[PDB]
Amino acid sequence: RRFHRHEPRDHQCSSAVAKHIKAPVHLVWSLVRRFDQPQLFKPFVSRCEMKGNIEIGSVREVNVKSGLPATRSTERLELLDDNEHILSVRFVGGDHRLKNYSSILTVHPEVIDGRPGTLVIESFVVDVPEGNTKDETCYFVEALLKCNLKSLAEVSERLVV
């Protein structure tokens, strides 16, 4: 929990979503660590471009699919601990209403139904846009994150069989 304890100010909101996955942690992490290919598990991503190798400070340009409140987002890699399985990303651009969005995703070992499994936790802190409440912003972000972690679980478990 020490990695998902943000200190939000009153004009912001912060929350977290979790997902249990019936797959070993190094497979799920092998998926999550591909900073250049978020479409690997994000259902809303249609295209992603990134220049150079993946390093702290790398910036990917993401295009999302139809039926969404936005089309593109510019996201920078803030942290990638390979052995601790920690990925932290900050939104730095795009045409969306998620200003100062920062997220931390951690992958942990866990026994599920007697078999090797994975606990994924993703927390975030974001500025509440003008006109919305905290509950609305956190609800919207939690919905997108829940979809992303559900898809990550399905792709990870399909890669085990």
């Binding site: 609800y139 919905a143 997108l144």
Partner: protein, 305 residues
């Protein structure tokens, strides 16, 4: 019995709009169109009479085109089978509540198609499939118009719209299922969901409509239950306009009606689909492009007179 269909990807990267035009897709039990008393007056109430019907459909897909295409391929088959079965049951009722029966047959049809899409029921492909057709975040609007000699029956599910150009006045045969609707907001919030203003009113701040086929990741807030409107045909009726929001977001009902009627009359005075109605649909599509739409555009025009 005469229509034209214009459809373009437009200024978009992908095509996720689909449409259907199936003539004689089914035989409608006449007891769904006339009361048993008016038919008994002509002695046409003992056996099971049937009147052939045509089906037109527009399906605005999002997150992909798989669900829209599937609706185009399946909705008319399922609806035809359902009407066929209901024909063997209308004769067992002293008085037929026609509107409730249309609502039930379209609701069961749309729910069946949605269950096939989500994988809750199996589907026939000599082979059977049970997995979902596509990802949970893929969905589609569905507006269908059953046209027959006596009535037009409209089933709407989403923000695509159909307009009847009647006389000097356009009559909307479907109300857009945007989540900001008072009854739809009441339903969604009553189920524990949220309607959030996030670049438009959206379910959970994500989807800009409250009803669609598929989109199982937003259930039970997004439902595939359609709203049905039964309208009798009159000699005032000129044409039907079925379109996705690629037209309605930039063209109003009145402008679409006057433009389509003028284009049909112009083609007729100057001179399988119909050439005049096709000219009307093409004119509407290119008019939506000219106004500045960056969306997929699908327009079906059905000449009634």
């Amino acid at each position: 019995p005469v229509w034209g269909c214009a459809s373009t990807r437009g200024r978009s990267a992908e095509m996720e709009d689909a449409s259907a035009a199936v003539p004689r897709f089914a035989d409608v039990p006449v007891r769904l169109l006339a009361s048993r008393r008016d038919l008994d007056a002509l002695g046409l109430d003992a056996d099971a009479l049937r009147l052939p019907a045509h089906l037109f459909g527009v399906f605005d897909g999002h997150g992909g085109a798989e669900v829209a295409n599937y609706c185009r391929e399946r909705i008319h088959v399922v609806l035809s089978a359902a009407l066929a079965r209901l024909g063997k049951n209308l004769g067992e009722m002293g008085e037929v509540d026609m509107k409730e029966h249309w609502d039930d047959v379209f609701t069961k049809c749309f729910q069946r198609v949605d269950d096939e899409v989500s994988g809750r029921v199996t589907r026939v492909v000599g082979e059977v499939r049970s997995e979902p057709v596509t990802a949970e975040n893929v969905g589609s609007t569905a507006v269908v118009a059953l046209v027959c000699s006596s009535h037009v029956v409209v089933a709407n599910c989403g923000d695509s719209r159909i307009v009847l150009c009647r006389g000097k006045e356009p009559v909307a045969l479907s109300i857009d299922h945007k989540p900001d609707r008072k009854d739809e907001r009441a339903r969604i919030e009553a189920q524990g969901g949220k309607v959030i203003q996030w670049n438009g009113y959206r379910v959970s701040g994500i989807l800009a409509m409250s009803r669609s086929i598929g989109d199982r990741y937003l259930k039970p807030f997004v439902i595939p239950k359609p709203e049905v409107m039964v309208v009798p045909r009159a000699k005032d009726d000129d044409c039907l306009i079925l379109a996705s929001d690629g037209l309605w977001d930039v063209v109003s009902n009145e402008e679409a009606c006057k433009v389509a009627r003028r284009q049909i009359l112009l083609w007729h005075k100057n001179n399988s689909t119909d050439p005049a109605a096709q000219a009307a649909a093409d004119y509407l599509m290119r008019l939506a492009l000219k106004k500045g739409s960056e969306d997929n555009i699908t327009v079906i025009v059905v000449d009634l007179k």
